[PDB]
Amino acid sequence: ELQEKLIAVNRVSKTVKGGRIFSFTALTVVGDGNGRVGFGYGKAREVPAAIQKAMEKARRNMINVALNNGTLQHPVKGVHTGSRVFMQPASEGTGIIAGGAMRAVLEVAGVHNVLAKAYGSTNPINVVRATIDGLENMNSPEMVAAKRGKSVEEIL
Amino acid sequence: GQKVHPNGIRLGIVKPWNSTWFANTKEFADNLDSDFKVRQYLTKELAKASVSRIVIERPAKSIRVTIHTARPGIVIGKKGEDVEKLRKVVADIAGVPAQINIAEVRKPELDAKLVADSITSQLERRVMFRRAMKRAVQNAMRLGAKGIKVEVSGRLGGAEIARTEWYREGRVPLHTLRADIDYNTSEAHTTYGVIGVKVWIFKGEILG
Amino acid sequence: TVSMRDMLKAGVHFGHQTRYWNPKMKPFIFGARNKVHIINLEKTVPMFNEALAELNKIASRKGKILFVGTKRAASEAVKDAALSCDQFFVNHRWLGGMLTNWKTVRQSIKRLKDLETQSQDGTFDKLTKKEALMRTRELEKLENSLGGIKDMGGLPDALFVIDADHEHIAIKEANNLGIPVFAIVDTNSDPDGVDFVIPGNDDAIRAVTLYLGAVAATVREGRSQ
RNA sequence: UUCUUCUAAAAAAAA
RNA sequence: CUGCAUGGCUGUCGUCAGCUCGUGUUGUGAAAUGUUGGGUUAAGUCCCGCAACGAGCGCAACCCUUAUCCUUUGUUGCCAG
RNA sequence: AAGGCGGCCCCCUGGACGAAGACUGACGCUCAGGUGCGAAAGCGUGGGGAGCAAACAGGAUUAGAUACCCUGGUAGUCCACGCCGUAAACGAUGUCGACUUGGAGGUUGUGCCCUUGAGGCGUGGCUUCCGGAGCUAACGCGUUAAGUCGACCGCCUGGGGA
RNA sequence: GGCGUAAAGCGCACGCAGGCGGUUUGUUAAGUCAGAUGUGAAAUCCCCGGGCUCAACCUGGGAACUGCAUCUGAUACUGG
Predict the structure, then answer these.
(1) How far apart are CA B107 and CA B197, in angstroms?
(2) Cα(first)–Cα(last) distance of chain C, in Å?
(3) CB < 7 Å to strand F — which of 56-75 in chain C?
(4) Residues 6 or more apart from C138 whose CB is under 8 A from it?
């Protein structure tokens, strides 16, 4: 049911008395092709075990993003430690205009038409954190209407 | 190489000898040589058949060798056809009357020699070494073994520099003498050289 | 269901010294007489009733609730209270990961169960005396730490914490797993993680026995329903 | 209390 | 010829007491915790405490020899009456 | 205000803070260029020179020792008037104003209650340490912000060259 | 976009020119906003069509040229 994407796999290291110990880290994202998406970061000595840990961590701690019919609902910007990210809704059939980790997380998150841009450092972990941060605090018309106590027609 | 051989260090505690006979010093050397010839010939002939252990014993000037294998149908074929063919040539090589018995090996996935030959054949037909190691360990742990550790060494995945990889699930106590650690090795003659495989299987502590 | 006069006799209104307060607990503090804070019972009572009501509601659906008190001033009181009301408790040290890492704590409770069967009815004596003492001590400490939850089967449906600050690890695990928290929170504790805040003293014997009797009463009534 | 210096070529993994 | 392409075997730090993993938690992260602390040991040996709970390779025991006694067996071994 | 200021007494003198009022009525904040103040070393002129001490000499250590250590010792350190205008001139954090949980002190006023002893309850100025949200690459900052804002100025655009 | 530690707060202050300015009322309409008029050559860019077999290319009409000047009006904010 859920679609899982592997974003970046790199080899981290650790020096001990014996010498260098090489470990692997796996950044993956999972989602239901709709408002549910979540990212996982796993680490192990082998890449299959790393990707498996990442998928288990990704399937938990997911969030609900109040998205439109196929796009976002307003231009929103997010930040997490090095990646000022900005994204806005686009018309039908323009695709996912995004780079690196952003493309994978958006695609799995179900949006199909979006203009995005990554400022600052484009580190994959930080941008996928910042992207879901912006998505998490993205207001919806019903939420803002109920929040301010007015009708959705009054706010349009 | 630092660790002593597990079967050797346990030869008088929980592990039996693979040749149990008596001989004075006059005929000890030629007896040992005869055992080597029959073992070499059998290992060469029964390469396809999964042979696990060749026990040799010679009571009253007549050699009797009992092969322990997991595929008796393959080694006998039609009833009484090639077992006699092996017995006559073994008797001719040793120069003494022979007799060949066959013991079936229940659960071949928990036998150190058979797992080594399986891994070595898979290596020779070029599968991923990691895949072979994982398959062997999972199969062994599923059939009820108290622990297995496998190690593969040398020019893995066609690399330029050799390395050693090993996995271990469960207990493999090598210092405990009463633990019946079944240990065996093998080697694969791949096109990039020879790769060595070692396997320790811990079946559970033996009391007495 | 619980008045104000009984609480005042128990000592619920007493808080901690002024140098130690925590500012997130300001709405429930009446004032400070003799350099010690006083909780306003006129505020603690109307929300304690809602907490007891919610606990009755969750009890009537045959839900497992977990009691957490380790201060040594409430250890016996929580143990006899939980047994009398047929619930679960942790009266000694809360081992970290007891809820989140339940996958291994299940193994440890299983170890406790087979070991106690071996000891009492299995009769696993007639071997070396030093090994028997080692197994006895292992079972003793394992029971001492995990006896109250040794037949729970799965993670509970609610948590009742005696001290919100001292038992911060349990509250954090519950929030991590989305399990509701009902807690007796003093003036020096942090109530953010708690879903059902209950202001009041968590140090006096009188007060703690009063709270435990009240929650035992409501959970028993709900189970009876 | 004093106790200086070691030029110039390495290799490491990729479900 | 190439141990600087290797298998197998061995030295070496060193029989020094250390080296890791699963799950959980903290940190964006490399990592940390466990494995640290108070005692104790030859020892990461054991107890208490403790966001850690457990497990594995190692630390000890199971093996050989030597030291005491008893039962069986006394020749080619022994000589108390 | 910064550099900085330590026995006691006198003369002249600047700034800061507190309690009650009264008064003028936006007169305010910042500031390129400009001006003033600005540790220590150094310069000029005239004094003074006990101790300390660049340079220098001698004695040690060392393979060497134009140094560290020892014995002496001159500019200088001190006074009067000018010049120089530079420091890790640092809180490595420009000035002014508003808002945002708290704890323990130091120092300096001042109001009330019986100063029922050196007690209790407030309210101002400066200042030290810890810490919540929040911010930060992290360390940390955290009502004296590196938080949330507004006004003005100076400065930065890879390292070396510089 | 930044200036504690990565490059970056002048050593500190006073202060002319310059930038900004608490709160209430009246007046003016310069800044600002609305409408109208004149102008912003043709081509080029964009929209809907037409002609070379299509396309490049040519071409009809519209939009755009975010600007400037004048007239009339609005007075909340800034300025007098």
Answers:
(1) 21
(2) 18
(3) none
(4) C115
CB neighbour class for C91 (10 Å; exposed up to 12, middle 13-18, buried from 19):
buried
Within window 12-71 on A, which residues have Cβ closer than 7 Å to strand D?
22, 47-48, 51
Cβ contact C35 with chain F strand, < 7 A: yes
The contacts of residue B152 (CB under 8 Å, 6+ apart) are B119, B123, B129, B132, B133, B164, B165, B166, B195, B196, B197, B198
**Do residues A132 and A106 lie in contact, with contact meaning Cβ atoms separated by under 8 Å?**
no
Contacts of C223 (CB under 8 A, 6+ apart): C59, C60, C62, C85, C86
Distance A152 CA to F29 C1' (A): 46
* Residue C119, Cβ density class (10 Å: 0-12 exposed, 13-18 middle, ≥19 buried): middle
> Which residues make Cβ contacts (< 8 Å) with residue A28, sequence separation at least 6?
A4, A5, A6, A7, A39, A40, A42, A51, A54, A55, A58
Nucleotide nearest to A20 (CA to C1'): D12
Q: Which experimental technique did the depositors report for determining this structure?
A: cryo-EM
* Residues 130-169 of chain B sitting with CB below 7 angstroms of strand D: 130, 157, 159-161, 163
**Integer Cα distance of A12 and A10 in angstroms:** 6
Q: Compute the distance between CA of residue B38 and CA of residue A122 in angstroms, rounded to an integer.
A: 68
Which nucleotide has the least CA–C1' distance to B130?
D15
Name the nucleotide nearest A48; use CA and C1'.
D15
CA-to-CA distance for C198 and C161, rounded, in angstroms?
Answer: 10
Closest residue (CA) to C1' of nucleotide F104 is: C19
All structural domains of chain C with their residue ranges? 27-94+158-225, 95-146
- Find, among A123, A80, A72, the residue nearest to A97 by Cα: A72
Q: Do the bridges between strand B147-153 and strand B193-202 make them parallel or antiparallel, or are there none, so unpaired? A: antiparallel
Alpha helices by DSSP H, listed for C149-203, are 168-176
The whole-angstrom separation of Cα B51 and Cα B69 is 4
